[model samples]
Target chain A: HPVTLDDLPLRADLRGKAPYGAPQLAVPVRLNTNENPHPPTRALVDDVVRSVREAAIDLHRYPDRDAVALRADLAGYLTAQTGIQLGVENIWAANGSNEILQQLLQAFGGPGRSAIGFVPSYSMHPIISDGTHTEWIEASRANDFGLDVDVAVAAVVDRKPDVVFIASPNNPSGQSVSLPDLCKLLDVAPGIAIVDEAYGEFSSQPSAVSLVEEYPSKLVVTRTMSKAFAFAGGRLGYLIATPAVIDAMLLVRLPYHLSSVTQAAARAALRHSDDTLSSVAALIAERERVTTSLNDMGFRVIPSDANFVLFGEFADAPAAWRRYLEAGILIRDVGIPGYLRATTGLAEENDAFLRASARIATDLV
Target chain B: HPVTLDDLPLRADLRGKAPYGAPQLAVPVRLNTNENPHPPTRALVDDVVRSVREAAIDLHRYPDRDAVALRADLAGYLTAQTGIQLGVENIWAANGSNEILQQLLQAFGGPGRSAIGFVPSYSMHPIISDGTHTEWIEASRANDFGLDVDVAVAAVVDRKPDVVFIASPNNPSGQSVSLPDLCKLLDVAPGIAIVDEAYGEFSSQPSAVSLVEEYPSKLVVTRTMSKAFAFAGGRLGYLIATPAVIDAMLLVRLPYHLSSVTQAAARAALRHSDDTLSSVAALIAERERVTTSLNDMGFRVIPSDANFVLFGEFADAPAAWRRYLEAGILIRDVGIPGYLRATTGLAEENDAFLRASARIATDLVPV
Candidate 1:
């Protein structure tokens, strides 16, 4: 009894909270967690193998503390993707977008400071805020799960938060904030505003990174290779900001925060990104088909610019989720009262999900 | 002008701090960070490549969040190394020892709480303490750089810190804290005491992991693959603690913290532990030779049980460090007044260091 977590001296806030994760169960169809459905091409895998084999030779020595080479590669990729000039000095990468957000909060929002995020967005924004001891202020998205520009501006004005998070191509809800709306929030935020674009590659909108030079200190655009590049297992996430923001991160990041293997694997993925990201168009097509099918089945599907769709109005979302699971499909019941999120997978996987969704629609509200 | 760090709204505590790192420079014989001097064996590298190649196939899927298989491997390794039975439930791992320490502090030490570490130990103790907003209490080791058990007990009893750090086979001064002394501090008023055995494999002493079963709630033993395992580039660090402590870490850790490639590569290295660890004896022998040579040259060499030696009483330590660097040899000036630390490297590298040490002996203080 004395060996339980209650007997241990865990932080007071974390006492009863379960660890955050989507169920990592094996199922016939896994559309939870928004992972890319496509696997790496053989050429990509071979490149990764060759690169990692070279890196493994020096597994005895620590990796480049700053990861200069990987960052340069990322900079070039972002430049091509966003059509905005970026350099190694403008980027910083970490284990995942989660670490990137955690580092930003550590640098800008800790005790005595507060961060404000729109609810029904990415859940980690608040979780990371709390982890960094930063006070979290939750404002509402519109009833449609889109950020209400006036409401957002008012929240920043009244709360005067030190950090404001706007997840472009937002998670769970699958909506992207407009550049003008993002600029409006950036203009009002008292400190810094982070545009978390973990799904940027899936979005049709112009990247918020284009605004970095305009709001040099106030805007940071975070991206990841997890979605379109099919590199979630690589766990590489990066942020594009001014050189100053990168410098601030340098002050707080753990030395050698990225492993040698991670750097090599990510660089290899970037090299083959053309081939890897070619699947994005197919996944986007699948998302559209899935969205239309859900809509046809009398479900309210949020218009998505991401690799996943948030749909429902189920009378009991968890029950519907279970029903889908019973059919060998696993989708995230993201705690929204009537909605569940499902990633767009390959064609046959989407067919299975559509079949499950049709059966689950009977439980709709 | 508005884009500078000074113009930005960085956290108040991190306002003027520079990023923490040793100078990563290229030299003929680099020995600054205490990385194992041996490169991985070809067989080990091949295994890692094969393992990572397989892992690359799933680059689109998320890795196991809990890292169950990797922890099992670490458990087996620790059980053999420490002669204490351990299981997967008893372990947790992170990117490196620094991340391991950071996660522990996040769980155990944070705002309003405090952590105490003996000075001139692993430098990250206080830096991470500050980073986590935990008030850092600096207790001093005796002048000889060994923990004074009485002072440690008194500090814990009086301060009642939420965390206490003990870097066994302590860095900068390579001395291991005896078990009796460790038990004394653990028995005192405290929350948790982390025994960082990052340099454990290089030490002659029993690991602090042996103490976990006896002090389940209050003791954590952290080990790294960086030092003796010759996997510094792999960035694997883990701790042995009770299941409850592992649970606490889960609540605070970033989901999918370990990459798939990391898990696969580390597992491969663990499979070849015999080949990987075969270089420790050679390093130890070189350490002894280096120690004797430094002592014979009238330098004060801290008795070492780890890979590096701290020797000094130099008239000017920084100047002496520059002298060594000028000779194309790089060692660490761990900021001990009139003292610098040098890691034992390859035989030829050590010989070059010795040749330079002989030339720099003129900077030593008069006995």
Candidate 2:
């Protein structure tokens, strides 16, 4: 009978929980949260807030329980980007893709069964699976940080795992599986394959959204707006799949999963993505220039088609990390083996990362 | 084979979709959505908008991935409301209790297990449980419209239900369970006993939120700002439970579950509930006055502690229902027993209801 609130041990799982803390950059460069450092013009932020203000009028009555308008816009955006057709029926969205992944776990993998993801991965796949009471089998990726397709496929086929996830343009490593690699795995393992393309907006490669239709029995691809849209704060994401798979997600999703403000803001962002594709084109150039500079510096940079570059064997990586930390430049030290992942920022910030990495490399020498 | 954009089907779940609609009332007395009739003053709305004008500044950075600051406000509000010491860790919230309930179902009963609620319940319980792949068992209340602890326990123990939900001061029939009955149910069954207090503001009974500590296995007593706070249009429901239960829910909840605007509005609304409690007192008084008059005229009025009153056994309930509809009164009518439930409205509107009900009851040709 403890008298206060702290007496309770959080769920055994949540007790030791230290969720990812958004790192503070000493000098204030914006790479830490995988955010698009390009702030939307004041005009854009005003427009987004205006749309939400309009939506706020109806915020009390539950939102589009299904985000009817949101799904359509997402379907429209996907069709434009992926060169594939996704009717509103083939698309599903949640307030954010983190929720989309959570829905998958609830629908396909809870208790007794398992969901598999490659290791040194997005922490959520295991975190969510743990909460859902499902066993997590972390398949090993080869040292080159590519999927060991055979091993992953064999595990799924043998255990008949309920879901298998691959963060295409994987978050920290910034590497995506080859088309052949994804298709071959989907063909054999015979369970849902989630190609999480959270950073697809920045990718040079065409979307793997096509595999969703080709392997309708199991393939799914998810995309999110936390990046590229410059509205990471406005949580939004959508998944592409056949009607049956989409049905499975809806069957399990929470009603009004996306709030009205999120719905309004995401729609505004999507509208602007079309009206202002050139600004995004600017970001693509920044990605190319930053990756090239990092590659030239003798870091074993993981080849990335996405906006961020990942490198291993940093020269005095910790001291370099602290130097950037001390400077207000914050890059994520992805606790992955020997990996430092930095996002493409504004031109000046990108220049600062090159300068900082170079100076740190010299200091280590 | 269709090319991009037009290729997807209508959502697999919502085929042959119905147009989305919200609570609308005749002459706008608005008890249909269970919201308080008194709208926040134009000044408060302006204050809120001015507040909104400020938050618009940092809309570019995603809000705290966790609604850190808002959670503190909600926790403080709960301590004020329930006197149950709470922290941000012990409480969980979402877009609405609709999503919050879904999170609970997903976290507790799914696939193999069943969730139990009574007949003529909140209407969304079955829909949510079905959506979560949980089996739904409708518990029957023995004739009195109150749970006989024995019958409720049989449904839980025999069916092996993972959850049991009861709306205290039950909706459409506003009756709160005695503390002993709740204690008995908790004593016999170990599964979650969800006490939905959506309409609690109208009830005279004590909130079961106090019993959460004694039961602790899984007692979730929920409250809503939708009704008493005059913010039904705002979509905020307050929930109370142990920290362990709240933690399991965090994993399943959508990130940024409550929007920044919603966060700010709820804080303002909670602070305003005290001044607002006067209006609820007004609605309660109207309900009592309406009941006394109707009962004196030989109409069987089910006593209610909520903003609405239910009266039944009128042979022409349907005709009376249409009359209200025509007169723009917009009351709720249950098809089964021809019972009509009317809401407490503004002073003049309540007079109109009394006159209308008196005119309609004039037909009861006394035996």
Candidate 3:
């Protein structure tokens, strides 16, 4: 009975909706935020410690509003990571990809505007569209979670939704879109085509980053330091679009959006991107190995390019989820009409998952 | 020229509008952001250093999504600061008040929806409402930059907008709202009433936070560490609601919104609230002295309760601004019809402003 909207005597429009619940977990294995499970390496911690100590002196000067120095480092990282030349305008970073998405919507979605994305995808796409109070039109995919090229193309040509957001290895479905299909949407949709590569590090496929040059302002790809760089706790998100698109995104962004301290940490993490990728590569490898193991154990695990494995258990999946929770391991419940998603974890954590599944199989099967 | 949106395929609706500009300091007074100029005291600095040192080991543990510990500390601080009892549910904190504004819009705003705010205000309001893609309906205030209760009531009752936003001390105006006026808007407005008390400390007025319980579905107020807390570089923002409103805000906010390091810095700042206020009080006093002095010197300066003074020399303001900038005392030349604003600075900085203004005025008046 914590004051629902119904209890509030406001306008008819603001009432009758359920408030968003931000639930907290006690024994949490938080794969939900798509953060790197690995703690920040030694250098990342060292950089933050040193920077905060140095910045302690200026607890006043409202920070470099645009974070020029951080942007330089981020631009450097993007060029090195994507092998594409980018200036400051090409690199826009924020507190998280969620904020990055909000920036995109704010810059593009105004009155009577529409932003489009795919279903069973990253929740932020539509929610941010909802935040902008714009239309979030969804194009359902084929049964395997891959976009139906013709169907997607039809939505693009028919409705001409302002943008098409294709999450690489789409979140719950864990399938990457084919480039030929991407070209189809980019070819005629008559709007910007955005490829959300938040989990790009975990995927084996090539990033659509190179598409920025090929497509003009038609394609924008977003990358994150939270995943793979082990800076989730540090809170940094970034985008890779044409310099022109980046310039537009810059407006509506608050000055001092990134504190000097955060800039330092993101830089330290990006400096060690290759080393962090070594860990992410391991997660990718372990993902393949676990998918095989789970599939062999009679569960349907999608062949995922990203870290998370979308799965189903024939022997009461929810019960298996409860047992996994009991074992002090956590996996996303997916909340889709039918499925649970377990993001592949660090070596020992993945083993813990297998062990939990084995124990449940022994009891229930 | 770079291919503007005209060439690049953008939404039919978004193409023609000029992309919003990042806030520019026509000059640089540091006052435009409502930031306190005094640096944090050394003891608090030591606390932050220590927290970072301890947290260095666990930069590994991702930040808490709910920020339970930080929320607990903040709830206590809010109660102590405003004497309003807030359970954790009553408060939702974010990277900055900007993000919190984004979160509020995300949760409530939608196509066909409208968010209303008083004008000549924190420019971030309409920017955020548009960010949420919600229709922004502006209510021009009758009392300078302060809210006009009658205007507000008429607009809300007529438009039936989704959210109503008001900043206490009301940014550049520094006018505090009368309690009676606030109550009137809450009663007549059809939607949620939000009081953005970002500069609460500088205002010599009672907080509207205690009145949260008086209005239904009301978002009482939001505060930031970027201002009076003297940690504008350090991040912290919070919305105090009637538990119900805080719950709605948290719905769309990302987990780990507050990093452990940020939580630590905010906690450190929280303990020194009075000390920070003392820092701002000095500025407020300095604000009074500067406004009065400028008025005597024939410059029109607004009487403000906030930590900055707005004054202009009209014809000579630009040259005076250039001299002040060269002297290294930054100020905002708001180019808004009649005035320029200078934030109260630290004692030495304030002296520099006085020295610079006197020199520049001497050149203009030719004594």
Q: Pick the candidate with the highest lDDT.
A: 1
Looking at candidate 2, what is the lDDT of residue B320?
Answer: 73
Residue lDDT tens for model 1, B13-126: 768646544353456786666667687777877777777677867543657668898899889987887788999989998877757888897788765577767654664432
Ranking by lDDT: 1, 3, 2
Return the lDDT, model 3, position A1: 39
Docking quality category of candidate 2 according to DockQ thresholds: incorrect
Chain A TM-score for model 3, please? 0.83
lDDT (0-100) at residue B98 of candidate 3?
A: 63
Q: What DockQ do you compute for every candidate structure?
A: 0.29, 0.08, 0.29
lDDT of 2: 0.63
Model 2: per-residue lDDT, tens digit, A204-272?
A: 777888777777767778887766774423546678887766766655544225555557777877776
> lDDT values of the candidates?
0.76, 0.63, 0.66
Q: Model 3 Cα displacement at B298 (Å)? A: 5.3
Candidate 3's residue-wise lDDT over B1-367, tens digit each?
2566567654454455456354533344444444565766777767766765565466546556687777787788778777767778788888776678777766666444567666646534333322333333345353354556676688778878777777777765667788888888787666667788877867777888878776647555788776677652355688887876666665455544566656666777777777786777788788777777776766656667677776654556666665677666667655444456777776666776776677666544332
Writing each residue's lDDT as its tens digit, candidate 1 over A55-87 gives 766653557667798999999988987799999
